[PDB]
Design a protein around this ligand. Structure first.
Ligand code: QVR
Ligand code: QVR
Ligand code: QVR
Ligand code: QVR
Lengths: 8, 343, 343, 8, 343, 344, 9, 8
């Protein structure tokens, strides 16, 4: 449960 | 404190452990739309920061404080509750800005500031805007704001629109149908299929999508951070009546958000809309339990009710119906545990 | 008050058992056909060890292992599960008409009460790298319910470690950390935190698979005998190693995997997560050196892997390694609870 | 966190 | 008290002219058919600029340019060379039966005594990146022997610079410096010299060719007019630039090449070392940033290239570049006399 | 002013020490595992020659050899280095917490002052063909600081000569020079310089490696004992040879390599650059004859290799050889300072 | 310390 | 020329 989603 | 009264300790521990990692800071900082826009908003409105006192709520690595320093700020109080505060302290010293930026570790609801400030800067937006319940810490920080003070961002708009995504809907049962077999290694699993379906439908879907799945102009619910009180976010009722622009099966509602930095020189917008370049917030979709057929020109009316919980998130209740036919559907979702579907 | 709560922070246990309450996570483990099939193979082909016996299933999840014990002829099976999955397990017991033989006991194995001693304990306590989750201590703790000369499935666990070369993986992780090398990220000097960034990223065990050609020496084995070990033996695990290098080049770190053996009366069945075997949901685990060691074929690489159990249900690991011929040493720390799922 | 890694 | 010796350390001049004393180095330059053929083209196609004229050949080497001037009908050619190659040039003049037209005068052009003023000066004073060797100053110094109506071949020089992206080249150079990152090289900690090593390697200009698709913007041009310039104009060369980025990505450095034009009475002939043209022994030159700058298409990359002549017959180069939209700035130094021949 | 400046032209010295000021040149040497590993083994395996001893390190570069002497237990190490690498060595001594035991003395060993005599001298004074760089003389010069008991690491050096056949290497010289043998290079007759181009190529020693099967006779050895030799012994080095040919063929020149021996109290360790051993950054060196000499198996190839020190920190090489059975003679003059690096 | 003109073929 | 030859 990542508060801020992983991004690229 | 206000924070501990509205938050389970177990939720808060995990929350701030997540933000103690430099790799998570890096994930946000590398978001060019996010980092660049905040920089533009602050630098292009330099008169709002020149010789001013600034409060940075949840500074993380402190990047926004440095932007406020680039804009000529006189003194910046940067509050951060995770262990990332010590890393921000290291960057303040190595950038020769100890005279201008003071890092205060702890929660903004619990630390003491020496003086009131002219403007508050922060990035309290979670996915679907409201997740993490940090907008309440951002509004709570107004107890340190001068009466004539300003907020950066100044307002936040959440947008709701109905969408059609047949494959997304059918994907839920394809996964749950794993349980619908009478002899999985000799065991009958079919009795848990319904529970698997319910489990998936409680999850908001975090990813992006082609704007052609949208079926109506979004409905906008605005939060004015200068006017709002943190009690306004405990229960967020969003009525909607969509004028359908396309005919088809509505499978749920899509969510995104914008914020505006209303400066003295100009207003800068940070958008996570699907029509804009992708950000680390992506977008969010909540499925109906059953789809609703709507003709173009029909109205799909209902309410989206977000009820804050002590896990730093919201329980989402969605009710919708097609007025012309009375066809009705709903769903109830847990925003704290979404499904990150992006690939 | 119990053995579990004294060695576990509440916040860790809350999220640990929440994770296992989701049916999707059961599906994830169950669909691992190597894992599920080998377990059924060990139990059914050693049916004499179960016929008319009393059984304990530690952490039964959906109860799949209890059904296998029932298929093999067990008289009664006590199935202990601490997460909310215990409710779904009971639903399956009833739908499969096995109420007369599988009794679900909700709770932690360190806290529940059993009506009788058992002849054999079954469980899947292996986390990635074997020791993660610290469930092996619960598995051993359950021996208090085991009759003298009672058996355990699995009976023993073998941890394997071997040095590897993988310049791509090293550069992939180093490139990430070098984000904090930037002296002017949007005008801000981040370099002060590069050291901390490198530390954080290289504390992350890399969980994925790899071709066996990257191994530079025959593996060393560390065996845990579950019939004999006490749970206190897992609080501080010291694994010495002395590798005889088979090829020359850079040693970027150590790779880890494990096998468990089900030593039954009919036959011994092995469940292996080695890179020479078909892939399982445990994959393999590699630990990266911040600076690789150069070694020639024929050199010996000696050192120690020290695993200190923490109260977040995992281990803090220190790996010290040196090339004996040259005195080139490497000291590293892994946070086994913060893995990088690279696959 | 994530105790057991995703698979297939 | 020669102009040459005042600006040149003896140790630099000794090795400089020792290099040019080797016939193998003449062959290397002469076999550059683009270089040699273009020079002959410029001279023969502007033959009226040479017919019955007095010519000075500065740094004639083996004398090929003097033979071209004689082919075009020059009445007298004074061929000046400071290396021992002058004696080989005399041999060729005699074996080619041109003792009556080509007069080799050994020595430095700043120190020899010519019998008369000349109508045109021919030379190949270009080093890599044009300015290396500081031979342009000897070329300009030679104008003391030029008639007021005189011409210069080459007549002008254009330096081009453009930003590039080349991740492979960056990692290649950074991988070399990382040797000094080792904390236990044969038991010795080298890491304290990491910084010095990175500085040394990245001070080296990279001399090789590359595909034009790595360039991220149209080149900026800096022109030296040899007819008008004076020696002192080359002691401090300041080249400002402002690129309009055509592609998004990482700017790893600046690429350099040069053109010279022979502006004759009949036609202008160009000798280009651009990467869009056939390769020459000058190749192209690239200066690497220790940390690349990120820029989006449409951004502006502004800054300055400053060349300070040194007494070792080369320049100390400082490059400052800035992505205007974000304030991301990169400062670099390069020792033009310590190049990395990568080809 | 000093012994060094008396035998070295300023321009040669400036270039020489600038080269050694680059970390990349130190790295090039340090990454030679045969070189670095053998020095470490020679020192650590003779720890009793270093335990609680006073050490002088001549040309320490980054200081790696001083750190091995420290690992071996030396009490005090004086590390002398003339290039700007000395400042980097001082950083590593500080960062390795050895400032109590290692003292970096910037300057030429012929010009610095040491506070006391030492028990052992360590150095890597070997250039290609052993003698290039004329650093052996600085190594021998340093014996003024050595106690009567003193030892030296390396203790002795052997240079080996052997005749080789390599038709392709020989013919390659004329292929390159024949560039000049054309009557109209863009209208210019270059042929008058062909002879000069040939001479230029033949004056170059060839630095690279080769298959040992090109060697035509057992090598001859010339030994320098560093404990006994004096500086003046290296100004004129005469190496007589009389090879008993093992194979019949054309002899195109002489091949050179060298070994050094660390003769310690516990054991003798050898560092060899022979073509029978793993390659090092010294490679091997070959000097061609102007004209090849035919020799049958059993014939004797006799002559002299004379190395004359020059003020460019190298040697002028004169090689004279004849096949005794036939009287056919050949020679060559080579400039050791400007070799051709042919390895690819 | 380098050559003024790069090697070329 | 380089006193110590390039080596890999
Ligand atoms: C989305 C960004 C979150 C950042 O703000 C910090 N943060 C969250 N909540 C608080 C409170 N109540 N006080 C201080 N800082 C807070 C997060 O740690 C993260 O850096
Ligand atoms: C790797 C599988 C773990 C399964 O066992 C359950 N579990 C973990 N730890 C305990 C304790 N102490 N008591 C009972 N069950 C336990 C996990 O919930 C999962 O199903
Ligand atoms: C790039 C070509 C250089 C040639 O010109 C000769 N050279 C350089 N500098 C001088 C001066 N000052 N006087 C005469 N000749 C010079 C080089 O030797 C080379 O042949
Ligand atoms: C082959 C290694 C040479 C190293 O020794 C240094 N060096 C040469 N010659 C001297 C003298 N006379 N005094 C001190 N150091 C010397 C080279 O600089 C290199 O590091």
């Amino acid at each position: 449960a990542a508060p801020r989603p992983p991004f690229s | 404190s206000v924070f501990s009264e509205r938050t389970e300790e177990s939720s808060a521990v995990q929350y701030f452990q997540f933000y103690g990692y430099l790799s998570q800071q890096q994930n946000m900082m590398q978001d060019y739309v996010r980092t660049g826009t905040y920089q533009r908003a602050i630098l292009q409105n330099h008169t709002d920061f020149k010789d001013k006192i600034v409060l940075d709520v949840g500074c993380g690595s402190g990047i926004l404080s440095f932007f406020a320093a680039q804009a000529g700020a006189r003194k910046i109080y940067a509050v951060e509750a995770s262990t990332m505060a010590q890393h921000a302290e290291v960057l303040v010293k190595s950038n020769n800005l100890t005279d201008r930026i003071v890092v205060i570790p702890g929660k903004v609801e619990e630390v003491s500031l020496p003086e009131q400030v002219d403007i508050i800067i922060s990035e309290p937006m979670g996915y679907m805007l409201f997740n993490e319940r940090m907008l309440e810490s951002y509004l709570h920080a107004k107890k340190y704001l001068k009466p004539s003070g300003n907020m950066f961002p100044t307002i936040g708009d959440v947008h709701l629109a109905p969408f059609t995504d047949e494959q997304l809907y059918m994907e839920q049962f394809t996964k749950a149908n794993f349980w619908y077999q009478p002899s999985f290694h000799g065991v009958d699993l079919s009795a848990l299929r319904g529970a698997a379906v319910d489990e998936y439908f409680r999850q908001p879907v975090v990813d992006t999508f082609d704007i052609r799945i949208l079926m109506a102009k979004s409905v906008k619910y605005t939060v004015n951070f200068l006017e709002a009180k943190e009690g306004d976010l405990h229960r967020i009722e969003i009525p909607f009546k969509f004028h359908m622009l396309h005919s088809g099966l509505v499978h749920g509602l899509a969510f995104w958000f914008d914020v505006a930095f209303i400066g003295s020189i100009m207003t800068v917008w940070l958008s996570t809309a699907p029509t804009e370049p992708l950000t680390h917030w992506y977008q969010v979709r909540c499925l109906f339990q059953s789809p609703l057929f709507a003709k173009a020109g029909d109205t799909l009316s209902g309410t989206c009710l977000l009820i804050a919980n002590k896990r730093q998130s919201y329980d989402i209740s969605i009710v919708a119906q097609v007025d012309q036919t009375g066809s009705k559907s709903s769903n109830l979702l847990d925003l704290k545990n979404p499904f990150f579907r992006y690939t």
